[PDB]
Amino acid sequence: GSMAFLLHQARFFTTVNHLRDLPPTVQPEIAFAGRSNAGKSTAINVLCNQKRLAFASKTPGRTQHINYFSVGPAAEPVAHLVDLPGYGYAEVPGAAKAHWEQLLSSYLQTRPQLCGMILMMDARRPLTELDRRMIEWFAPTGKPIHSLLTKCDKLTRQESINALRATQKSLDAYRDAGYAGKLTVQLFSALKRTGLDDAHALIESWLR
């Protein structure tokens, strides 16, 4: 059936933390990217209508990981969801900074199966410097980025509109510079389940 149904069949597949160890999967995958692991995990559970899929209550340790999730039946998946690690708001100095820079840029630019990126940004504070870097890393691919302005229930109606238009304007600058891939945006609220049908429809458009 629907993209909703397929999403709801989701299950955890594997974790991954080096470029060479990405699963050799046939199917297309979507990447979820963002400063917040909290918001990512919460977005994945709501899109799949599950309580306990995306590691929502797991306490960050010393290391980070990509996580893969079958879409459709786990025995016979029709896609994967790739939760890329939250870069937060400042970058952690140390040998793992380089590692993750190389990994993510090479993944974004050359992972054959990757058909697009969902970029999760707090509506109150869109488009940080690290958000911008994920955009620029994806540039050469000509692949799309859909931006979710998250926690949109915390803004007034006017403020949310203002945020849509501000992000739109920032995204156009990229197109005007020559950015090949399609840049879109919507409001999104995990808590109030806002923007969910639009989020499903976009995903369906990419995967099928």
Cβ proximity to Cl ion, 15 vs 73, nearer residue: 15
Cβ proximity to Cl ion, 143 vs 151, nearer residue: 151
Q: Which of 19, 78, 96, 127 binds Cl ion (CB under 5 A)?
A: 96
Answer yes or no: is 58 a known binding residue: no
Give how far the C-alpha of residue 147 lies from the chain's centroid of Cα atoms, to the nearest Å: 8
Cβ proximity to Cl ion, 42 vs 141, nearer residue: 42
For 198, the token pair is 């639009």
Asked whether the beta carbons of 182 and 202 are under 8 A apart, the reply is: no
**Per-residue 3-state assignment (H helix, E strand, C coil) for 21-73:** HCCCCCCCEEEEEECCHHHHHHHHHHHCCCCCCCCCCCCCCCCCCEEEEEECC
Q: Measured between alpha carbons, how far is 77 from 72 in angstroms, rounded to an integer?
A: 5
Q: Which of 82, 104, 120, 202 binds Cl ion (CB under 5 A)?
A: 120
Asked whether the beta carbons of 180 and 135 are under 8 A apart, the reply is: no
Q: What is the largest CA-CA distance in the chain?
A: 46
Give the CA angle between residues 58, 195, 80 to the nearest 5°: 50
Our finding on whether 116 is near Cl ion (CB under 5 A) is no
Our finding on whether 104 is near Cl ion (CB under 5 A) is no
Q: Measured between alpha carbons, how far is 8 from 19 in angstroms, rounded to an integer?
A: 28
Smallest separation, CB 191 to Cl ion (Å): 7
Q: Which residue is nearest to Cl ion (CB)?
A: 39
Interface stretch with Cl ion, choices 1-9, 50-58, 169-177, 183-191 (CB under 5 A): 183-191
Answer yes or no: is 85 a known binding residue: yes
Residue holding tokens 């931006």? 147
Answer yes or no: is 200 a known binding residue: no
Answer yes or no: is 7 a known binding residue: no
Our finding on whether 86 is near Cl ion (CB under 5 A) is no
Interface stretch with Cl ion, choices 66-74, 132-140, 142-150, 164-172 (CB under 5 A): 142-150
Q: Annotated binding residues for Mg(2+), as ranges?
A: 41, 63
User: What residue ranges bind Cl ion (CB under 5 A)?
Assistant: 36, 39, 63-64, 96, 120, 150-151, 190
Q: Annotated binding residues for GTP, as ranges?
A: 34-41, 61-65, 83-86, 150-153, 187-190
